[PDB]
Amino acid sequence: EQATVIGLVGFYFKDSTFKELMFIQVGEKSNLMNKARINTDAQQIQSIRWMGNLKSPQTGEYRLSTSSDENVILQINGETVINQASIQKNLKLEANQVYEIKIEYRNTSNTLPDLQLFWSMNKEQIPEKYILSPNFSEKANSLATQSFFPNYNLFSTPVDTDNDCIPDEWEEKGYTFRNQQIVPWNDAYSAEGYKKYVSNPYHARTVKDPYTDFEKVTGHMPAATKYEARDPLVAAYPSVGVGMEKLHFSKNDTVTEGNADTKSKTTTKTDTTTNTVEIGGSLGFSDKGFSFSISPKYTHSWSSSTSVADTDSTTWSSQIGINTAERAYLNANVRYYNGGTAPIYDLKPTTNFVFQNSGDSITTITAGPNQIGNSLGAGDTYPQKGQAPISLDKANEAGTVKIAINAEQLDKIQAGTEILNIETTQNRGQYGILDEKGQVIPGGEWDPIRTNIDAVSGSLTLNLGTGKDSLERRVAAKNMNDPEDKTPEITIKEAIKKAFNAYYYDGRLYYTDQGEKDIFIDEPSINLITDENTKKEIERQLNQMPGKTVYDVKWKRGMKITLHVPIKYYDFETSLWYYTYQESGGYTGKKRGRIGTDGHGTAMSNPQLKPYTSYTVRAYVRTASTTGSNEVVFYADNSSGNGQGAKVSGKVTGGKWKIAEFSFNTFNNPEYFKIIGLKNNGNANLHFDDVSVIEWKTNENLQKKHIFEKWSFDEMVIGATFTRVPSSKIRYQWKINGRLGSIIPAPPLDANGKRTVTYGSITAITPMELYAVDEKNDNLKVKVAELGESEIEKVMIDAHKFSGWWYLSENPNLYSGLSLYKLPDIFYNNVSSYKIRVNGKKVQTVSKPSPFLFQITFNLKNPNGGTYPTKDASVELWATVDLKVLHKWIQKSDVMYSQ
Ligand SMILES: [Ca+2]
Ligand SMILES: [Ca+2]
Ligand SMILES: [Ca+2]
């Protein structure tokens, strides 16, 4: 905390009559004019007004003197004290009481040498300690206080309607803040890094936040404020939230990490807006070159969703040994972040852990300035960056807290069907202000200031990475109901730029962070996400502008946009893709990959795809001639875009720049989408640039979670029984020997956790495959059970058991029939005939015997010649689908029957 800003603000005019402002030097403190010599314009000044406040140290009497009292008029509280050294005029001042200062200073010829300020109680020189800043909040929007730009001047003058001491014509035309002074902005300064500020010449607080435009653009704010918030247009505004790092869960109410019966799982905060985008159906080659994304559940980033990885081998309810009706105590480790731009002070957030889809609460905690800090800085975090995360019981003011859920919900959380959201309340806190000395002092409730800022601005969120701290920004916009507001109007690009303190690089906006891994955020490089209302306002605007990019639309009060960073991004511009030429051009950037008339470019090192995530791939294409019609394909395939994967067949190219986009769910086969690539085949060349790849949320591994057991099979049905299933609503679908049955819903588990899926119109056991179908999407299957012809072969062969032999009443050493048990009809209609060889002789073929209920029988008189078998014959039996079914020797030991 430097506090160099505290002091006399001074207005340096070039002429002798306070009329052509040149610069506004802040924070002068005793040796006047000296701080301002850093301006190359300083020795050309002939009139200077200072304004500020003087602290009177001890009670008593002071005589006030200067260097060139000849050319100084000095009022304090309006009363003239020096007037070209025509009075010595004594002043009785009280101790610890402050007084307004107005110094004017003029020389009809000669530049002014520096100016000095002197004490006395009987000389001396005024310590910088007792020289303070003009009270900015109350010289703001009042009358009959005295003005910063008064026309009289006391020996055509600037107007400043606000009294935030930024002239009207400056707030409109543009200014900046270079060398701790405010100067009118000329475009040179942009190459030095200076930003072009504009603001409202009629409100002192354009974006309605605690500091006047001047305090913001200068520095009269807390030191922990993001540089962003110096722009009159982006607000000082906090975003305190809390993400979860570890989730522990015990069988007993003593859920503390490091303990018997206390399992501990790791977790990661993820922005909820993006994790609730439902992919859609894919756009593939269309004009009006922009994509877009809508979230239903658009969530401000002070409200984290929590991600869990189901690496685990076994359900967590089994991991601790609790059953259906026993409860599972649990506890967690968390970290508080401030995604905002302003430090919040004396905070007290109460925080709600909820289920995403059935908005049920789990628990609540309230944290005090004793449990977390006195304050939370902008972009800071408690516990700090290198530190371990504090525990729920260490966070909650009221100590530990019983948190119990059942086995059902606890395994749904592992499986990811219940996402665990952490909404945390914004109302309690305090903004900082600069005092007399230059250290933060709590200055007021944040709650009314937040409602006022939100009223007058839009909402911009940079969600970089599913584990990294987001940025919550608010940028003012016009008041559309007022046909006279002078809040400056800016496009989306200008707002994104201002919101994130982003810089240019070949016209390419880009965001540089503290981990210094810079990111391109111009429209083709990121992925935008809005709610429903902003979609309409954007699309309403882009029907009236034929050069249509989202970044061009006028930025309107009440919008909500989220920037989402791609996971692979090919901007053809460096030192890449196979069979493609770098060349020179580009949608954005400098170069712009191209392929030929059969040209078949693919990607060197394309992205890492996950087993049940869904992705979006976007590209920018043109023809490289006028009209030269060619036919493109854009794919994410394992065979150049010929099945298993995702192609978009591009029937439309001629001339200008167009988007081409497709989305897919890698659904138990990420490998099917290994390679991104463009095939061209037509009249002209093919240009393209800015290929991007966007990641959208993993789902439950349907195949992994199914576990199989047994095959079931008078009763006329086939059924597949599962011990474990996934916890998601799914469907099933049979493949009966190539043909695919209707999609059917999941049957309900009964008793045990057993689900069994079945097939009805079955007459003879045939090879079958059971597919698990996605809940909503009919084209997302996965095999979960299969019945193959070598298994059926085994079932047929076992379904033939031996009932007994048939001897004769009339001679009981002669046998006459072999009988098996009747087969069940689902099996028997699968045999067509039998073959029987008795006494190794001729292999007779006989038709399917008609069961005489309880057992089928073949006779032996005739495959054995005419002799009723031999007491020791060999009987062999086949049944064709041929399949040896029994091979047996007639023994006196076996079951026998007679007639
Ligand atoms: Ca002003
Ligand atoms: Ca203003
Ligand atoms: Ca480029």
CA–CA dist 286, 279 (Å, integer):
18
Cβ atoms of 448 and 455 within 8 Å: the answer is no
Per-position b or e across 762-782, b if 16+ CB within 10 A of its CB: beebeebbbbbbbeeeeebbb
- Ligand 3 centre distance from Cα of residue 590 (Å): 5
> CA-based angle 568:301:617, to the nearest 5?
20
C-alpha distances out from residue 32 to 36, 62, 65, 104, Å = 8, 20, 13, 12
Cβ atoms of 51 and 101 within 8 Å: the answer is yes
Phi and psi of 826, rounded to 5°?
A: -60, -30
Cβ atoms of 660 and 621 within 8 Å: the answer is yes
Please give the single-letter amino acid code of residue 350: T
> CA-based angle 877:879:884, to the nearest 5?
50
Nearest to 207 by CA among 479, 554, 531: 479
What residues contact residue 542 under an 8 Å CB cut-off, 6+ apart?
Answer: 288, 290, 548, 550, 552, 553
- Ligand 2 centre distance from Cα of residue 200 (Å): 4
Chain breaks in the chain (C to N over 2.5 A) after: 122, 144, 155, 575, 713, 881
C-alpha distances out from residue 773 to 101, 432, 442, 737, 768, Å = 78, 56, 58, 18, 16
Instruction: Tell me: cis bond preceding 383? Omega within 30 of 0 counts.
Output: yes
CA–CA dist 521, 571 (Å, integer):
12
The alpha helices in 91-241, defined as continuous H runs, are 168-173, 188-192, 213-217
Which SS3 state, helix, strand or coil, does residue 297 take? coil
Per-position b or e across 313-350, b if 16+ CB within 10 A of its CB: eebbbebbebeeeeebbbbbbbbbbbbbbbbbbebebe
138 among annotated binding-site residues: no
- What are the structure tokens assigned to 478, written together? 């016009």
Nearest to 440 by CA among 376, 525, 387: 376
- Ligand 2 centre distance from Cα of residue 79 (Å): 28
Please give the single-letter amino acid code of residue 654: G
- Ligand 2 centre distance from Cα of residue 201 (Å): 4
Cβ atoms of 216 and 201 within 8 Å: the answer is no
Q: What is 412-449 written as a DSSP string?
A: HHHHTSS-EEEEE---S-EEEEE-SSSSEEEEEESHHH
312 among annotated binding-site residues: no
CA–CA dist 484, 68 (Å, integer):
46
Complete domains list, the chain, with CATH: 8-230 (3.90.182.10), 240-433 (2.60.120.240), 568-698 (2.60.120.260), 702-793 (2.60.40.1790)
411 among annotated binding-site residues: no
Could you write out the three-class secondary structure of 588-632?
A: CCCCCCEECCCCEEEECCCCCCCCCCEEEEEEEEECCCCCCCEEE
Q: Return the number of other C-beta atoms located less than 10 Å from residue 801's C-beta.
A: 12
- Ligand 2 centre distance from Cα of residue 533 (Å): 30
Q: Name the region of 141 (left: φ>0; alpha: ψ -120 to 50; beta: rest).
A: left
- Ligand 1 centre distance from Cα of residue 149 (Å): 10
Cβ atoms of 553 and 541 within 8 Å: the answer is yes
- Ligand 1 centre distance from Cα of residue 66 (Å): 30
How does strand 686-696 pair with strand 675-682? unpaired
- Ligand 1 centre distance from Cα of residue 163 (Å): 6
- What are the structure tokens assigned to 705, written together? 């979670």
Strand partners, 677: 602, 635
Nearest to 133 by CA among 434, 441, 431: 434
101 among annotated binding-site residues: no
- What are the structure tokens assigned to 851, written together? 């069961």
How does strand 457-463 pair with strand 560-564? parallel
- Ligand 1 centre distance from Cα of residue 172 (Å): 9
Where do we find the tokens 């020179």? 584
CA–CA dist 534, 554 (Å, integer):
12
Q: Return the number of other C-beta atoms located less than 10 Å from residue 744's C-beta.
A: 15
CA 117 to chain centroid, in Å, comes to 56
What residues contact residue 99 under an 8 Å CB cut-off, 6+ apart?
Answer: 53, 54, 56, 76, 77, 93
Cβ atoms of 62 and 80 within 8 Å: the answer is no
What residues contact residue 547 under an 8 Å CB cut-off, 6+ apart?
Answer: none
CA–CA dist 530, 298 (Å, integer):
7
What residues contact residue 287 under an 8 Å CB cut-off, 6+ apart?
Answer: 656, 658
Write down the experimental method used for this entry. Answer: X-ray
689 among annotated binding-site residues: yes
Cβ atoms of 690 and 571 within 8 Å: the answer is yes
Q: What is 842-875 written as a DSSP string?
A: --EEEE-----SS-EEEE-SSTTTTS---TT-EE
Kindly tell me the sign of the dihedral angle through the C-alpha atoms of 69, 73, 77, 81: positive
- Ligand 1 centre distance from Cα of residue 39 (Å): 22
- Ligand 3 centre distance from Cα of residue 508 (Å): 9
C-alpha distances out from residue 761 to 506, 716, 719, 789, Å = 67, 8, 12, 19
CA–CA dist 758, 715 (Å, integer):
12
Per-position b or e across 358-373, b if 16+ CB within 10 A of its CB: eeeebbbbebeeebbb
Which SS3 state, helix, strand or coil, does residue 667 take? coil
Cβ atoms of 131 and 8 within 8 Å: the answer is yes
Which SS3 state, helix, strand or coil, does residue 450 take? helix
Cβ atoms of 121 and 62 within 8 Å: the answer is yes
What's the DSSP call for residue 236? Answer: P
Phi and psi of 163, rounded to 5°?
A: 70, 30
Cβ atoms of 45 and 15 within 8 Å: the answer is no
- Ligand 2 centre distance from Cα of residue 148 (Å): 13
C-alpha distances out from residue 456 to 171, 319, 344, 476, 540, Å = 18, 52, 21, 6, 21
Per-position b or e across 242-277, b if 16+ CB within 10 A of its CB: bbbbbbbbbbeeebeeeeeebbbbebbbbbbbbbbb
What's the DSSP call for residue 213? Answer: H
- What are the structure tokens assigned to 746, written together? 């999941």
Cβ atoms of 342 and 733 within 8 Å: the answer is no
Where do we find the tokens 């976007």? 618
Q: Give the up-direction half-sphere exposure of residue 660: CA atoms within 13 A in the CB hemisphere.
A: 31
What residues contact residue 709 under an 8 Å CB cut-off, 6+ apart?
Answer: 721, 722, 723
Where do we find the tokens 């001074």? 10
Q: Return the number of other C-beta atoms located less than 10 Å from residue 552's C-beta.
A: 16
CA 201 to chain centroid, in Å, comes to 37
- What are the structure tokens assigned to 297, written together? 């559940």
Nearest to 290 by CA among 546, 655, 567: 546
Strand partners, 660: 619
825 among annotated binding-site residues: no
287 among annotated binding-site residues: no
882 among annotated binding-site residues: no
Strands (E), 774-810: 783-787, 802-808
533 among annotated binding-site residues: no
- Ligand 1 centre distance from Cα of residue 445 (Å): 25
CA–CA dist 488, 477 (Å, integer):
7
CA–CA dist 702, 611 (Å, integer):
10
| Nearest ligand, CA 147 | 1
Could you write out the three-class secondary structure of 691-742?
A: EEEEEECCCCCHHHHCEECCCCCCCCCEEEEEEECCCCCCEEEEEECCEECC
Q: Return the number of other C-beta atoms located less than 10 Å from residue 445's C-beta.
A: 14
Cβ atoms of 473 and 238 within 8 Å: the answer is no
- What are the structure tokens assigned to 794, written together? 């085994």
C-alpha distances out from residue 578 to 125, 229, 405, 570, 681, Å = 75, 45, 53, 12, 17
> CA-based angle 361:362:368, to the nearest 5?
95
Q: Compute the residue count for the chain.
A: 899
Strand partners, 197: 175
How does strand 874-877 pair with strand 47-56? unpaired
Phi and psi of 170, rounded to 5°?
A: -80, -45
| Nearest ligand, CA 488 | 2
What's the DSSP call for residue 235? Answer: P
Please give the single-letter amino acid code of residue 650: G
CA 670 to chain centroid, in Å, comes to 22
Where do we find the tokens 């167009």? 658
Phi and psi of 797, rounded to 5°?
A: -65, -30
Cβ atoms of 858 and 817 within 8 Å: the answer is yes
Cβ atoms of 156 and 132 within 8 Å: the answer is no
What residues contact residue 252 under an 8 Å CB cut-off, 6+ apart?
Answer: 261, 329
**CA max distance for the chain:** 159
CA–CA dist 397, 15 (Å, integer):
63
